């Protein structure tokens, strides 16, 4: 689909579930895919600091 | 083709020299003898290797039809000169000289590679040709003539880095630059480990890393070798895969001196069934014993070998005869003691060592200007 | 020589001595005759244009006698055009090696 | 991760202790420094050996 | 007497000196200078001047009448413009700028960083940049 | 007449063209293998060959901020998104 706001959330949550289940570089890559996707949301007033 | 041709010369390097170890050797030499159209080097083993199979008629027809597949077009070319270009065309010897190295021998390689050398004057043509002289330089292992064309490609073909002939500047730090001068050409020239992947001609990476970790811990003792082997990340993944690499690394740095004989013998047991079977530890073990000792005798200037009976290994008499070998022939700077049971060390001072060094170089330059004073002036 | 420095008197404006040329500014910035290498036919996606260059540059060089027999002049100037950076530079770099 | 973040802070804190309680002298016997660290002296010999090396 | 001879040459300076700039040298002890009087000459030089001071196109001193090379100046003399002198920092702190964290960090590594980590460029093959350009809407 | 001659047109490139242009302008680098360059070429629908050269600089720039002489796939995948963002004006 085209969606942007929810896709930042599910990549951020998958960045948890490999670090919580002990996988660094896959969680590092899934973090970075959420970084470049969050460059298109005009109002992340709470999701910014959640990502931060 | 020629990129999996690394295996055949290495397995041929493996077979005959262990005389007792020849059961599984002949079980896959038959894969290397009659398959892959491999022709020469076992007929020269006719009085070297075993009795034989009938390898004569089945393969002399297979060398013939495959030569007759090739020998017609190579010697004639004349085909696209019908439309009169340069009275020649460039499709003949640059495309079939590779068979003249793979299945054809070095004689068919040497006359073809120099024939296509003066054909095209590009470095990109001189790229692949010189690298074939060097790959066959491992094949028939004529390891003196192919020491030349490396430097002849270091001079003219090497103009830089910047991914290039760096493809086979993976012919400039594990075939020719560090062999039997090896104290520091493993040291200075192994600084880069910078890639991971196994492409279709990168057939050896993971076992290649087991080389460059067994030669890693050699260059520098502790002026931060520990970052490039433990804090390094691409080396971290393979020790996460391989425990024999990991435990042997983490024995040495973490100072588990007792498990060294375990961790050396596991390396030694790996060195029992390896192809390298002519000239061996031109660095390793009882230098790695003195590498273990140089860090152990450091920080302790009054040591007892009763403490050596459990911290490093057993055999109180075995350590005692071991250090008698090492001290007495100019290594391992210390002074062992009898029935007080002391291992005492002595060190040069910050000036006694340099006064010993300036007296050596001063005599060499004085002897030098002795001679040049009298060559001139009668 | 023309365009050459000289030493000149301040009173009688007489020549004393030919001063040397400092550099030759054309021949200091003489354009490089660097090695004609190709990256080969593997510029695919341009092969129609590659066939045009062979039939206008290589075919005069390789086959003079087709022009000598038929009696037609060989070309000497080819114009390339398009958007910049689409291989205006790097294609004629390659063709000079193929010949 | 309380595992890594404490232990690297813990193994930092040993020589943070040791630089003070070794400072006043030049030559000590090691059973006193095992007492001032309040620990067995076996790992202290291994920890101090890591410091000089 | 040769060291008495060097000192007695030194009356030739005496400070009514004019300033040119060194251009080129022909041979032993004869050169070309470009004066600040607009024209261009062919002069003689003293045997006293140490020859290590030459070719930055150095600022040089010349005689008035006879117009020879007499002295080599400090090289920063004929500049006619100065740097940020001693105290004219315009009183803008680094944290005074609000919210330019991409571009503040980018320019800061564009200037200060290749002073230290120069060879990391060549090992990658970056060929580090000489200059930087800035642009945008006015303000 | 006589002096110069036939003219040859150059179209905008394609996927197989930009992939070859990628391999030629990323040739003089110190890069790391284990990467899909064909995905990188197919993330660009209408990029020019000169824009490809700007990507290889930014990938080397992202390699510099890693303090690595490796050049990974993560560097290109952000650099393609950056240069096409710079190409987002018409």
Beta bridge partners of E30: E27, E44
Q: Rounded to whole angstroms, how far apart are CA atoms E47 and E70? A: 10
Q: How far is E93 from chain F (nearest CA, A)?
A: 25
* SS3 assignment, position E26: strand
The rounded Cα B233 to chain-centroid distance in angstroms is 24
Beta bridge partners of E59: E21
* SS3 assignment, position A22: coil
Give the residue from B139, B154, B142, B94 showing the smallest Cα distance to B120. Answer: B94
Rounded to whole angstroms, what are the CA distances from F36 to F22, F23, F31? Answer: 12, 12, 13
The phi-psi region of residue E35 (left if phi > 0; otherwise alpha if psi is between -120 and 50; otherwise beta) is beta
Two tokens at B29? 């030499």
Q: How many CB atoms lie within 10 A of CB C85?
A: 18
Two tokens at A51? 């990502």
Inter-residue contact B264 to B252 (CB < 8 Å): no
Inter-residue contact E62 to E17 (CB < 8 Å): yes
Question: Which technique was used to obtain these atomic coordinates?
Answer: cryo-EM
Give the residue from E49, E93, E44 showing the smallest Cα distance to E67. Answer: E44
* SS3 assignment, position C16: strand
F48 interaction partners in chain C (CB closer than 8 Å): 83-86
What does the DSSP 8-state code read for residue D41? S
Best residue in A27, A36, A37 for a mutation probing chain F (most F CBs within 10 Å) = A36
Inter-residue contact B324 to B286 (CB < 8 Å): no
Place of tokens 């040739």: F27
Two tokens at B51? 């009795």
Q: Do F69 and E121 touch (CB under 8 A)?
A: no
Best residue in C32, C33, C37 for a mutation probing chain B (most B CBs within 10 Å) = C37
C79-81 vs E59-62, strand pairing mode: unpaired
Q: How far apart are the first and last CA of chain D?
A: 30
Rg over alpha carbons for chain E, rounded to the nearest Å, is: 24
Q: Rounded to whole angstroms, how far apart are CA atoms B32 and B13? A: 12
Q: Rounded to whole angstroms, how far apart are CA atoms C96 and C94? A: 5
CB nearest to B163's CB, from F31, F68, F70: F31
Q: Do F34 and B197 touch (CB under 8 A)?
A: yes
Determine the residue of chain C that is closest to F4 in CA distance.
C77
Q: Do F28 and B163 touch (CB under 8 A)?
A: yes
Length of chain D: 53
Q: Rounded to whole angstroms, how far apart are CA atoms A6 and A4? A: 6
* SS3 assignment, position F15: helix
Length of chain B: 378
Q: Do E120 and F64 touch (CB under 8 A)?
A: yes
Q: Do F64 and E121 touch (CB under 8 A)?
A: yes
Determine the residue of chain F that is closest to C86 in CA distance.
F49
Cβ burial, residue C84 (10 Å; 0-12/13-18/19+): exposed
Inter-residue contact E64 to E16 (CB < 8 Å): yes
Two tokens at B235? 């080396």
E32 interaction partners in chain C (CB closer than 8 Å): 19
Q: How far apart are the first and last CA of chain C?
A: 40
Q: Do chains A and C touch (3 or more CB pairs under 8 A)?
A: no
Two tokens at A34? 């959420």
Q: How many CB atoms lie within 10 A of CB F25?
A: 19
Q: Rounded to whole angstroms, how far apart are CA atoms B304 and B321? A: 15
Question: In angstroms, how far apart are the furthest CA atoms of chain B?
Answer: 97
E125 interaction partners in chain B (CB closer than 8 Å): 161-162
Q: Rounded to whole angstroms, how far apart are CA atoms B90 and C41? A: 14
B295 interaction partners in chain D (CB closer than 8 Å): 53
Q: Rounded to whole angstroms, how far apart are CA atoms E85 and E67? A: 34
* SS3 assignment, position C15: strand
What does the DSSP 8-state code read for residue C75? P
Q: How many CB atoms lie within 10 A of CB B68?
A: 9
The rounded Cα C63 to chain-centroid distance in angstroms is 22
Give the residue from A26, F63, F43 showing the smallest Cα distance to B195. Answer: F63
Q: Rounded to whole angstroms, how far apart are CA atoms D41 and D47? A: 10
Q: Rounded to whole angstroms, how far apart are CA atoms B220 and B227? A: 12
Rounded to whole angstroms, what are the CA distances from C69 to C51, C60, C64? Answer: 23, 13, 9
Q: Do chains C and F touch (3 or more CB pairs under 8 A)?
A: yes
Q: Do B196 and F28 touch (CB under 8 A)?
A: no
Taking the Cβ of residue C35 and every Cβ of chain B, the question of whether any pair is shorter than 8 Å is answered with yes
To 10 degrees, what angle do helices B243-252 and B260-270 make?
140
Give the residue from B145, B204, B166, B197 showing the smallest Cα distance to B6. Answer: B204
The rounded Cα B338 to chain-centroid distance in angstroms is 43
Cβ burial, residue B353 (10 Å; 0-12/13-18/19+): exposed
CB nearest to F10's CB, from C42, C75, C87: C87
Give, for B290, the enclosing helix (H) or strand (E).
helix B285-297
Inter-residue contact B12 to B41 (CB < 8 Å): yes
Complete DSSP assignment for E52-115: GG-SS--EEEE-SSS--EEEE--TTSTTS---S-SS------GGGS-S-HHHHHHHHHHHTGGG
Cβ-Cβ contacts under 8 Å for E58 (sequence gap 6 or more)? E21, E22, E72, E73, E75
Q: Is E137 annotated as a binding residue?
A: yes
Best residue in A27, A29, A31, A37 for a mutation probing chain F (most F CBs within 10 Å) = A29
Q: How far is A27 from chain F (nearest CA, A)?
A: 13
Give the residue from B169, B228, B162 showing the smallest Cα distance to E121. Answer: B162
Cβ-Cβ contacts under 8 Å for B278 (sequence gap 6 or more)? B17
E120 interaction partners in chain B (CB closer than 8 Å): none
Q: Rounded to whole angstroms, how far apart are CA atoms F66 and F72? A: 10
Determine the residue of chain B that is closest to C54 in CA distance.
B85
Give the residue from E76, E36, E68 showing the smallest Cα distance to E49. Answer: E68
Q: Rounded to whole angstroms, how far apart are CA atoms B119 and B128? A: 14
Inter-residue contact B305 to B319 (CB < 8 Å): yes
Complete DSSP assignment for B69-85: HHHHHHTT--STTSS-S
What does the DSSP 8-state code read for residue E45? B
Q: Rounded to whole angstroms, how far apart are CA atoms F58 and D5? A: 35
What does the DSSP 8-state code read for residue B341? T
Q: Do C38 and B122 touch (CB under 8 A)?
A: yes
Q: How many CB atoms lie within 10 A of CB B281?
A: 11
Taking the Cβ of residue C26 and every Cβ of chain F, the question of whether any pair is shorter than 8 Å is answered with no
Cβ burial, residue B29 (10 Å; 0-12/13-18/19+): buried
Rounded to whole angstroms, what are the CA distances from F64 to B359, C57, E69, F75? Answer: 47, 44, 50, 10
Give, for E72, the enclosing helix (H) or strand (E).
strand E69-72
* SS3 assignment, position C65: helix
Q: Rounded to whole angstroms, how far apart are CA atoms D23 and F38? A: 63
Q: How far is D52 from chain B (nearest CA, A)?
A: 6
Q: Do F69 and B192 touch (CB under 8 A)?
A: yes
Rg over alpha carbons for chain D, rounded to the nearest Å, is: 12
Q: Rounded to whole angstroms, how far apart are CA atoms E71 and E13? A: 8
Inter-residue contact C74 to C60 (CB < 8 Å): yes
Inter-residue contact E26 to C16 (CB < 8 Å): no
Q: How far is C64 from chain B (nearest CA, A)?
A: 8
Inter-residue contact A37 to A14 (CB < 8 Å): no
C6-8 vs E30-35, strand pairing mode: unpaired
Beta bridge partners of F70: none
Determine the residue of chain D that is closest to B295 in CA distance.
D53
Q: Rounded to whole angstroms, how far apart are CA atoms F43 and F58? A: 16
Taking the Cβ of residue F78 and every Cβ of chain E, the question of whether any pair is shorter than 8 Å is answered with no
Q: Rounded to whole angstroms, how far apart are CA atoms F49 and F21? A: 6
* SS3 assignment, position C81: strand
* SS3 assignment, position A50: helix
D52 interaction partners in chain B (CB closer than 8 Å): 298-299
Rounded to whole angstroms, what are the CA distances from B340 to B293, B307, B309, B319, E70? Answer: 21, 13, 15, 16, 82
Inter-residue contact E48 to E6 (CB < 8 Å): yes
Q: Do F74 and A36 touch (CB under 8 A)?
A: no
What does the DSSP 8-state code read for residue B162? S
Q: How far is B161 from chain E (nearest CA, A)?
A: 8
Q: Do B255 and D49 touch (CB under 8 A)?
A: yes
Q: Rounded to whole angstroms, how far apart are CA atoms E3 and E1? A: 5
Q: Rounded to whole angstroms, how far apart are CA atoms E28 and E45? A: 9
Rounded to whole angstroms, what are the CA distances from D6 to D1, D16, F28? Answer: 8, 14, 46
Burial call B285-304: b when 16+ CB within 10 Å, e when fewer: eebbbbbbbbbbbeebeebe
Q: How far apart are the first and last CA of chain F?
A: 41
Determine the residue of chain C that is closest to B83 in CA distance.
C63
Residues 1-53 of D with CB under 8 A from B: 46, 48-50, 52-53
Would you list which residues of C are annotated within the binding site for ATP? 82-89
Inter-residue contact E124 to B163 (CB < 8 Å): no
Would you list which residues of C are annotated within the binding site? 82-89
Q: Rounded to whole angstroms, how far apart are CA atoms E22 and D7? A: 68
What does the DSSP 8-state code read for residue A48? H
Q: Rounded to whole angstroms, how far apart are CA atoms D51 and D31? A: 18
E123 interaction partners in chain B (CB closer than 8 Å): 161
Residues 43-82 of F with CB under 8 A from C: 48-51, 53
* SS3 assignment, position C91: helix
The phi-psi region of residue E19 (left if phi > 0; otherwise alpha if psi is between -120 and 50; otherwise beta) is beta
Q: Rounded to whole angstroms, how far apart are CA atoms B205 and B20? A: 30
CB nearest to F32's CB, from B161, B164, B194: B194
C87 interaction partners in chain F (CB closer than 8 Å): 10, 21, 49
Complete DSSP assignment for B182-232: TTSTTTGGG---------SS---SHHHHHHHHHTGGGS-SSSS-HIIIII-
Q: How far is C48 from chain E (nearest CA, A)?
A: 34
Place of tokens 């036939």: F6
Give the residue from C43, C45, C19 showing the smallest Cα distance to C95. Answer: C43
Taking the Cβ of residue B298 and every Cβ of chain D, the question of whether any pair is shorter than 8 Å is answered with yes
Q: How many CB atoms lie within 10 A of CB B59?
A: 18
Cβ-Cβ contacts under 8 Å for D33 (sequence gap 6 or more)? D21, D22, D41, D44
Beta bridge partners of E35: E20
Rounded to whole angstroms, what are the CA distances from E3 to A44, D26, E7, E50, F3? Answer: 83, 60, 7, 15, 73
B199 interaction partners in chain F (CB closer than 8 Å): 33
Rg over alpha carbons for chain F, rounded to the nearest Å, is: 16
Cβ burial, residue E57 (10 Å; 0-12/13-18/19+): middle
> CA triplet E67, E31, E45: central angle to 5 degrees?
55
Which chains have 3+ CB pairs within 8 A of F? A, B, C, E
Inter-residue contact B240 to A22 (CB < 8 Å): no
* SS3 assignment, position E91: coil
Which chains have 3+ CB pairs within 8 A of E? B, C, F
Q: How far is B198 from chain F (nearest CA, A)?
A: 8
B343-344 vs B302-303, strand pairing mode: antiparallel
Give the residue from B76, B22, B81 showing the smallest Cα distance to B50. Answer: B22
CB nearest to C49's CB, from F5, F8, F49: F8
Inter-residue contact B163 to B195 (CB < 8 Å): no
Resolution stated for this PDB structure, in Å: 3.3
């Amino acid at each position: 689909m085209d969606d942007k706001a929810l896709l930042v959330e599910v990549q951020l949550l998958e960045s948890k579930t490999y670090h919580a289940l002990s996988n660094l570089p896959k969680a590092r890559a899934a973090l970075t895919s959420a970084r470049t996707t969050a460059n298109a949301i005009y109002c992340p007033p709470k999701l910014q600091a959640t990502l931060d | 083709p020629k990129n999996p041709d690394l295996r055949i010369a290495q397995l041929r390097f493996l077979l005959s020299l262990p005389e007792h170890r020849g059961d599984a050797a002949v079980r896959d030499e038959l894969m290397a003898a009659v398959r892959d159209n491999n022709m020469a080097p076992y007929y020269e083993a006719l009085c070297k290797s075993l009795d034989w199979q009938i390898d004569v008629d089945l393969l002399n027809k297979m060398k013939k039809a495959n030569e007759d597949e090739l020998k017609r077009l190579d010697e004639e070319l004349e085909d696209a000169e019908k439309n009169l270009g340069e009275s020649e065309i460039r499709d003949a010897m640059m495309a079939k000289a590779e068979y003249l190295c793979r299945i054809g021998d070095k004689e068919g390689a040497l006359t073809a590679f120099r024939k296509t050398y003066d054909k095209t004057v590009a470095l990109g043509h001189r790229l692949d040709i010189v690298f074939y002289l060097l790959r066959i330089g491992l094949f028939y292992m004529d390891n003196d003539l192919i020491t030349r064309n490396t430097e002849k490609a270091k001079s003219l073909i090497e103009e830089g880095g910047d991914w290039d002939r760096r493809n086979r500047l993976k012919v400039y730090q594990g075939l020719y630059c560090v062999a039997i001068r090896d104290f520091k050409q493993a040291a200075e020239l192994f600084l880069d480990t910078v890639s991971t992947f196994t492409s279709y001609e990168l057939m050896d990476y993971k076992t290649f890393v087991t080389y460059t970790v067994y030669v890693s811990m050699i260059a520098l003792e502790r002026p931060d070798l520990r970052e490039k082997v433990i804090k390094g990340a691409e080396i971290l993944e393979v020790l996460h895969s391989l425990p024999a690499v990991r435990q042997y690394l983490f024995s040495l740095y973490e100072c588990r001196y007792s498990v060294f004989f375990q961790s050396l013998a596991v390396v030694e047991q790996e060195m029992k069934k390896d192809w390298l079977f002519a000239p061996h530890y031109r660095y390793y073990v009882r230098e790695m014993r003195i590498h273990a000792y140089s860090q152990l005798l450091e920080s302790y200037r009054s040591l007892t070998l009763g403490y050596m009976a459990e911290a490093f290994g057993v055999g109180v008499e075995f350590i005692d005869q071991e250090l008698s070998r090492f001290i007495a022939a100019g290594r391992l700077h210390c002074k062992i003691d009898k029935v007080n049971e002391i291992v005492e060390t002595n060190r040069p001072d910050s000036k006694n060592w340099q006064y010993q060094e300036t007296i050596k170089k001063g005599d060499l330059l004085l002897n030098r200007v002795q001679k040049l004073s009298r060559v001139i002036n009668m | 020589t023309p365009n050459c420095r000289v030493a000149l008197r301040n009173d009688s404006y007489t020549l004393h001595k030919i001063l040397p040329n400092k550099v030759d500014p054309l021949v200091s910035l003489m354009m490089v005759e660097k090695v004609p290498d190709s990256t080969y036919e593997m510029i695919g996606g341009l092969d129609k244009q590659i066939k045009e260059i062979k039939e206008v540059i290589e075919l005069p060089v390789k086959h003079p006698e087709l022009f000598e027999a038929l009696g037609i002049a060989q070309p000497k100037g080819v114009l390339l055009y398009g958007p910049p950076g689409t291989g205006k530079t790097l294609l004629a770099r390659a063709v000079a090696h193929h010949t | 991760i309380i595992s890594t973040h404490l232990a690297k802070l813990y193994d930092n804190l040993l020589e943070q202790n040791l630089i003070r309680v070794i400072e006043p002298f030049s030559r000590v016997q090691i059973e006193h420094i095992s007492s001032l660290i309040k620990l067995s002296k076996a790992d202290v010999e291994r920890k101090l050996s890591q410091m000089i090396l | 007497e040769f060291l008495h001879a060097q000192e007695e040459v030194k009356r030739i300076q005496s400070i009514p000196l004019v300033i040119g700039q060194f251009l080129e040298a022909v041979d032993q002890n004869t050169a070309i200078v470009g004066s600040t009087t607009g024209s261009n000459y062919y002069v003689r030089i003293l045997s006293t001047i140490d020859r290590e001071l030459l070719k930055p196109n150095a600022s040089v001193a010349l005689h008035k009448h006879s117009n020879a090379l007499v002295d080599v100046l400090p090289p920063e003399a004929d500049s006619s413009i100065m740097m940020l002198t001693s105290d004219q920092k315009p009183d803008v702190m680094y944290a005074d700028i609000g919210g330019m964290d991409i571009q503040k960090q980018e320019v800061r590594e564009a200037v200060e960083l290749p002073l230290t980590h120069f060879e990391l460029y060549k090992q990658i093959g970056i060929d580090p940049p000489r200059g930087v350009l800035m642009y945008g809407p006015p303000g | 007449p006589g002096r110069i001659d036939r003219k040859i047109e150059f179209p905008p490139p394609n996927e197989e063209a930009r992939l070859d242009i990628l391999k030629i302008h990323s040739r003089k680098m110190n890069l790391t293998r284990g990467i899909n360059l064909r995905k990188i070429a197919e993330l660009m629908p209408g990029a020019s060959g000169a824009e490809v050269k700007g990507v290889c600089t930014e990938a080397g720039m992202y390699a510099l901020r890693e303090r690595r002489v490796h050049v990974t796939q993560e560097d290109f995948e952000m650099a393609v998104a950056k240069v096409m963002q710079k190409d987002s004006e018409k």
